[PDB]
Write a protein that binds this ligand. Structure first.
Ligand SMILES: Nc1ncnc2c1ncn2[C@@H]1O[C@H](COP(=O)(O)OP(=O)(O)CP(=O)(O)O)[C@@H](O)[C@H]1O
Ligand code: ALF
Ligand SMILES: [K+]
Ligand SMILES: [Mg+2]
Length: 994
């Protein structure tokens, strides 16, 4: 219940009315557990059902094609022709193709693993409370802890609830909140009020947050809030999102099924108009059932003529093709559609630490004293290469490589670094990589001493395992670490009391080695080491030292600095009280200053250039980090988001600063700003939202649990493979190899996928609004149905279905990444591109009804009926308007239908060559490009021939077309299609808008 880190220990103990040393009474626990319920996040239950599919039955590629499957199932129950056997295939292929596409929707969805469940792994099973019914501490179910009870935590513990700290039993309590701030560096807590009620977690140094863990120490607190009323609870709350995914491609293809569905219902009324003559002319009586059999035969034929049944499968294979192409860049795509959505992205938001940077604390600079006399102090300054905990990198003085052992200054530097140091480097043989044991900041020094190798030890021949701590080990064989004076908040340093290992001499080289806050340590330094020599700490020396420290702590190199000193004459081991850290500062006095070191969690090698390339492709990168504004900015300058001398005011905010802007100014601030620093998880998704509120496609890239809300908001969330599992779970792509330059590759991939999707979509629709043309002359002129649905499906699904996907193999438009992101308010079909495929679709429609009308009217071979009133075909019994009796029933012939269809296949093979481009003509551009499009055309017509000259088929379709007959003309009807789209192609490529 409590709403403050801003209250005092007392006011909080007060709020819930509880003794710090006795805890809660069973009475109170009863109440609280009643008022507040249990301490746990609910498990993303929002909505679900085996039923799922029950809702993927909305669009046209359902309802429209669902009638046509029942409307076509009733009609195929009254098929009292002589083909009662080949009857109800239509009902069953409409629904087998409907059950097919639908079941891919679900084996792709029954894959999701929830972030919320990934997130609840940060929930400790047990918690330790002090309650009233016992003197002893009580391990209880962490879910059975209520706001108010006294809680105890220690090293390794996961924090159970959100807790005000009451008492720190240790000399320092170090927490890891990378869960919330995305930095694993240990924050050092305290007890004092944090009075700002608008303080962010980074500020709330007296709180323990549920889900964080104790790096080190022991502490007593009072639970302040539990369950979903916690900071992690807020992360959980923005995970649950009933808001269904509306991908940028998918939506344009959902109101196209909406506008074509209105063309459907409304061209079934456009038939009621030319037909319906039977209320005025057909003498009131002519097989009355023939009306619902005709109106419904060509109703469920306009259904299937219009819809591209093949398209789902084609598309869902253009994606899978790219998904597997991305897989080979170690970009693991999780949601198929998202491979595209990356190309149209205009903004990329990015977590800093572990994403744009390696997240390996690196000492990149260090100095020692060089020369001192009078008013003059020169330093030796170095630089150290390496952005990783691996002992790979070299120490440079003036950009040229040196040996650190050539410098007595560095020998001591290194020593202090090895000994004043609780960390340790470990080579994980499984992951195949060096990892830290300990604080990142201390582990940085470990690695520095390895890299440095001041005793010039032979290390080349060493196993990686053994190379880990090699140089460190040398130094600690030299000096026995006697005991260690732990860091305290008072003195901002720590140190180590050390004895020599070798000397029987009666001369005690006994020594304390100190590191810490540079100001603090330099004050307690009376001397300054100059190699092997010791000289007094004058004021002009202290000034030179303190000056560079000011410089390295602030520039475009904004480093974490640390001073290193030794106490040459330490106290006597038995004069020192190691129980009371308040004493330790005084033992750490009379020091000889040794040198200084600067640290960075450095950028990944390839992040800078990826950023540069993103810029060229017209994409803007934004950093949104829970780390500090100075660090954030200096990384930005290094990866090129800012200029090395750019003045950044107004282009970088902290979470706090952002919050103080009026809501309007905030939304504008996301348009111009690039670092958002010291943010909370919810800042990241607020920002992604403002961005998207300008109808911009935004990606979020990161790796932390604090990244999750924004990984979700963003159109595309992209996780790093070394990141958290929840971040992986929340995103659609994981860069397995942490290669940040693969994101650029993924956008180029997205852009090419789109280009091709639209080129193969034009191809596929032209033969839909081109079969409907044919069903509307096969009906408006009372002609005999030139095509039946079973042929339509097969064609739309397969003959077209193949070269459709060979137009996914279409050569990637080069310079694809020299232009900007397409607009989302971009139309696919244009006022004139519609005029194109409507011009063509129109042609062929006639050309196939005009091959049903050349196996009669000019029927060179079989049953010809020249200029014959094919207004009727029921007329057969009464051969009076037309003589020719005993000829009856040639209208149901297989051959007139074989011609229409083979003309359709042949024209949808030349259309697949005009759709080998857009404006690019086959005149200038060789048709013989895609060896794959050729392969698909052969396979296409090689299957049409398996659909002619084979067993069981041709029976579901129609009788074989003979050479010298139904092919010469199937080919003579086809050719012109090229010329029609080659003149329409001139229209664009000689006098078009451009
Ligand atoms: N084990 C250790 N030995 C020596 N110095 C240490 C240390 N752990 C931390 N430091 C030093 O701690 C000094 C201050 O740490 P502290 O956590 O107390 O908070 P703070 O004063 O840095 C403010 P803030 O958290 O907002 O930046 C740092 O500059 C760091 O150099
Ligand atoms: F790694 Al972060 F904000 F969590 F940069
Ligand atoms: K997402
Ligand atoms: Mg991170």
């Amino acid at each position: 219940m409590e709403a403050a880190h801003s209250k005092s220990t007392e006011e909080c103990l007060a709020y819930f009315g509880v003794s710090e040393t006795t805890g809660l009474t069973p009475d109170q626990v009863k109440r609280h557990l009643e008022k507040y319920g249990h301490n746990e996040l609910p498990a993303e239950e929002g909505k679900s059902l085996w039923e799922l599919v029950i809702e993927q039955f909305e669009d046209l590629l359902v309802r429209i094609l669902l009638l046509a499957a029942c409307i076509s199932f009733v009609l195929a129950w009254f098929e009292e022709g002589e083909e009662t056997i080949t009857a109800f295939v239509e009902p069953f292929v409409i629904l087998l193709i409907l059950i097919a596409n639908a079941i891919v929707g679900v084996w792709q969805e029954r894959n999701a693993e929830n972030a919320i469940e990934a997130l609840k792994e940060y929930e400790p099973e047990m918690g330790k409370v002090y309650r009233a019914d016992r003197k002893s501490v009580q391990r209880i179910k962490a879910r059975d802890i209520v706001p108010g009870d006294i809680v105890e935590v220690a090293v390794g513990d996961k924090v159970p609830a959100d807790i005000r700290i009451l008492s720190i039993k240790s000399t320092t309590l170090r927490v890891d909140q990378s869960i919330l701030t995305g930095e694993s560096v240990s924050v050092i807590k305290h007890t004092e009020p944090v009075p700002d009620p608008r303080a962010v977690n980074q500020d709330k140094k007296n709180m323990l947050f549920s889900g964080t863990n104790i790096a080190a120490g022991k502490a007593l607190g009072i639970v302040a809030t539990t369950g979903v009323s916690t900071e992690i609870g807020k992360i959980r709350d923005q995970m649950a999102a009933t808001e269904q995914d509306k991908t940028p491609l998918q939506q344009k293809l959902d109101e196209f099924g909406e506008q074509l569905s209105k063309v459907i219902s409304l061209i079934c009324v456009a038939v009621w108009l030319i037909n319906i003559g039977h209320f005025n002319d057909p003498v009131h009586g002519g097989s009355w059932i023939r009306g619902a059999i005709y109106y419904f035969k060509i109703a469920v034929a306009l259904a299937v003529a219009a819809i591209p049944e093949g398209l789902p499968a084609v598309i869902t294979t253009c994606l899978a093709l790219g998904t597997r192409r991305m897989a080979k860049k170690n970009a693991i795509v999780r949601s198929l559609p998202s491979v595209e959505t990356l190309g149209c992205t205009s903004v990329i938001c990015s977590d800093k630490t572990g994403t744009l940077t390696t997240n390996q604390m690196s000492v990149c600079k260090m100095f020692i004293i060089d020369k001192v006399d009078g008013d003059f102090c020169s330093l030796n300054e170095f630089s150290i290469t390496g952005s990783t905990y691996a002992p790979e990198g070299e120490v440079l003085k003036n950009d040229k490589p040196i040996r650190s052992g050539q410098f007595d200054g560095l020998v001591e530097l290194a020593t202090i670094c090895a000994l004043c140091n609780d960390s340790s480097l470990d080579f994980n043989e499984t992951k195949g990589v060096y990892e830290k044991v300990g604080e990142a900041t201390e582990t940085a020094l470990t690695t520095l001493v390895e890299k440095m190798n001041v005793f010039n030890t032979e290390v080349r021949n060493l196993s990686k395992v053994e190379r880990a701590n090699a140089c460190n080990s040398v130094i600690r064989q030299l000096m026995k670490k006697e005991f260690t004076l732990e860091f305290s908040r008072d003195r901002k340093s720590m140190s180590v009391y050390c004895s020599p290992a070798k000397s029987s001499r009666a001369a005690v080289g006994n020594k304390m080695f100190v590191k810490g806050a540079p100001e603090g340590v330099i004050d307690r330094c009376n001397y300054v080491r100059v190699g092997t020599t010791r000289v007094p700490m004058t004021g002009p020396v202290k000034e030179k030292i303190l000056s560079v420290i000011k410089e390295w702590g602030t520039g475009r190199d904004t480093l974490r600095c640390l001073a290193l000193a030794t106490r040459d004459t330490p106290p006597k081991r038995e004069e020192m009280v190691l129980d009371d850290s308040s004493r330790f500062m005084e033992y750490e006095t009379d020091l000889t200053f040794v040198g200084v070191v600067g640290m960075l969690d450095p950028p990944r090698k390839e992040v800078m250039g990826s950023i540069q390339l993103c810029r060229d492709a017209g994409i803007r990168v934004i950093m949104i980090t829970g780390d500090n504004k100075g660090t954030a900015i200096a990384i930005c300058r290094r990866i090129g988001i800012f200029g090395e001398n750019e003045e950044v005011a107004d282009r970088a905010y902290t979470g706090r600063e952002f919050d103080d802007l009026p809501l309007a100014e905030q939304r504008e601030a996301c348009r111009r700003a690039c670092c958002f620093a010291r943010v909370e998880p919810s800042h990241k998704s607020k920002i992604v939202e403002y961005l998207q509120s300008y109808d911009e496609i935004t990606a979020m890239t990161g790796d932390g649990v604090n990244d999750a809300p924004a990984l979700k908001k963003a159109e595309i969330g992209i996780a790093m493979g070394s990141g958290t599992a929840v971040a992986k779970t929340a995103s659609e792509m994981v860069l397995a190899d942490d290669n940040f330059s693969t994101i650029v590759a993924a956008v180029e991939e997205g852009r090419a996928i789109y280009n091709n999707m639209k080129q193969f979509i034009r191809y596929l629709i032209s033969s839909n609004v081109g079969e409907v043309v044919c069903i509307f002359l096969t009906a408006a002129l009372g002609l005999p149905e030139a095509l039946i649905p079973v042929q339509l499906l097969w064609v739309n699904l397969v003959t077209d279905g193949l070269p459709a996907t060979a137009l996914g193999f279409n050569p990637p438009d080069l310079d694809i990444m020299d232009r900007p992101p397409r607009s989302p308010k971009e139309p696919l079909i244009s006022g004139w591109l519609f005029f194109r495929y409507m011009a063509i679709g129109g042609y062929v429609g006639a050309a196939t009804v005009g091959a049903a009308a050349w196996w009669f009217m000019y029927a060179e071979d079989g049953p010809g009926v020249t200029y014959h009133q094919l207004t009727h075909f029921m007329q057969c019994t009464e051969d009076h308007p037309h003589f020719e009796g005993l000829d009856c029933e040639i209208f149901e012939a297989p051959e007139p239908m074989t011609m229409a269809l083979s003309v359709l296949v042949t024209i949808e093979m030349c259309n697949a060559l005009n759709s080998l481009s857009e404006n690019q003509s086959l005149m200038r551009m060789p048709p013989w490009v895609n060896i794959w499009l050729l392969g698909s055309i052969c396979l296409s017509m090689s299957l049409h021939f398996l659909i002619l000259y084979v067993d069981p088929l041709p029976m579901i379709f129609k009788l074989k077309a003979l050479d010298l007959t139904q092919w010469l003309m199937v080919l003579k009807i086809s050719l012109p299609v090229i010329g029609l789209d080659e003149i329409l192609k001139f229209i664009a490529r000689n006098y078009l808008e451009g």
